[PDB]
Amino acid sequence: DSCIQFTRHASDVLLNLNRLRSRDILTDVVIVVSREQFRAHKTVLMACSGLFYSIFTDQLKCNLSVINLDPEINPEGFCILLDFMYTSRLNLREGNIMAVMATAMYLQMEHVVDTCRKFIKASE
Amino acid sequence: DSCIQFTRHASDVLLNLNRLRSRDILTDVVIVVSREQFRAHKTVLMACSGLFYSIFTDQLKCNLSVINLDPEINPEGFCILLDFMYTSRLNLREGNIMAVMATAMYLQMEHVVDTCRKFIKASE
Amino acid sequence: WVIP
Amino acid sequence: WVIP
Numbered sequence: 001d002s003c004i005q006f007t008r009h010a011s012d013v014l015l016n017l018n019r020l021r022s023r024d025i026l027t028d029v030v031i032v033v034s035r036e037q038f039r040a041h042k043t044v045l046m047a048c049s050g051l052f053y054s055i056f057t058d059q060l061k062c063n064l065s066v067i068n069l070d071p072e073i074n075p076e077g078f079c080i081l082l083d084f085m086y087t088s089r090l091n092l093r094e095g096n097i098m099a100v101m102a103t104a105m106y107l108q109m110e111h112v113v114d115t116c117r118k119f120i121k122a123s124e
Numbered sequence: 125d126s127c128i129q130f131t132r133h134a135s136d137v138l139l140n141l142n143r144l145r146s147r148d149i150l151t152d153v154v155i156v157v158s159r160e161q162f163r164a165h166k167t168v169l170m171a172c173s174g175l176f177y178s179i180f181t182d183q184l185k186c187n188l189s190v191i192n193l194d195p196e197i198n199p200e201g202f203c204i205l206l207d208f209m210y211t212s213r214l215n216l217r218e219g220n221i222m223a224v225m226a227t228a229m230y231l232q233m234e235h236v237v238d239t240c241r242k243f244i245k246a247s248e
Numbered sequence: 249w250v251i252p
Numbered sequence: 253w254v255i256p
């Protein structure tokens with residue numbers, strides 16, 4: 001087509017989605033991790049994660065307001081990834097890289113799994 | 125902080141939100157324009173428009189599944205702007221610029237209003 | 249704004 | 253990935 005494009009549009013949208021999350025506006029699901037609860041927007045979770053995409057496209061699960069993750073999932077690893085989903089920023093540290101990579105593999109967040117693999121390989 | 129950032133994350137999220145819109149997945153509102161109906165996600169509309177932000181933060185309106193726009197709003201102008209919201213791409217043409225600017229002013233989409241004003245000024 |  |  002002959003469209004023009006606003007360079008900062010996608011970033012501004014994500015920033016506003018994160019402001020709605022902060023203020024708990026229009027959040028429609030609770031993600032339960034080892035008895036730690038995280039409120040989010042189903043559409044943002046689906047846009048970021050192959051696991052959430054599969055869950056919320058399921059005819060029965062699409063209607064659930066609570067999703068319980070596998071007990072092996074670490075709440076801090078989940079929190080870091082949820083923050084990444086809403087900001088593009090990943091708080092990757094020596095002390096959390098293993099939990100973050102394991103959580104990203106479970107959530108099916110391929111780009112996160114990729115940078116974790118590379119950061120681990122650099123330290124060996 | 126000491127975060128790393130994935131450059132394409134915001135764009136990939138918006139692309140996935142637009143794929144959900146295309147497939148009518150988890151859309152939660154119908155926007156009615158001069159008897160033309162547009163399905164969308166309330167959170168994306170709020171992230172893009174000052175008008176939708178005000179509407180869906182209202183304690184009564186946040187629960188509506190149908191929103192009727194002012195009858196002076198042109199459905200094509202709305203369609204072009206809804207496409208912009210989900211893609212960052214604006215189909216701005218000599219034949220639609222007046223309707224697009226009027227719709228962007230009503231929807232409170234300041235960056236769109238800005239480029240319309242500049243494109244109009246260049247033609248005078 | 250840019251030409252994409 | 254970048255340093256923001």
Ligand SMILES: O=C1Cc2cc(Nc3ncncc3Cl)ccc2N1
Pocket residue numbers: 046047048049050051053108109110111140141143144
């Ligand atoms: O690594 C990843 C990130 C990711 C996101 C999604 N999301 C969607 N895919 C296609 N159409 C719509 C949506 Cl919402 C699916 C798989 C994966 N895998």
Ligand SMILES: O=C1Cc2cc(Nc3ncncc3Cl)ccc2N1
Pocket residue numbers: 016017019020170171172173174175177232233234235
């Ligand atoms: O031009 C514009 C675009 C736009 C978007 C919004 N959205 C939000 N603002 C702040 N926190 C959350 C959200 Cl969702 C408000 C005003 C305007 N004005």
Ligand SMILES: [Cl-]
Pocket residue numbers: 048109110111112113
């Ligand atoms: Cl990812």
Ligand SMILES: [Cl-]
Pocket residue numbers: 172233234235236237
């Ligand atoms: Cl705008």
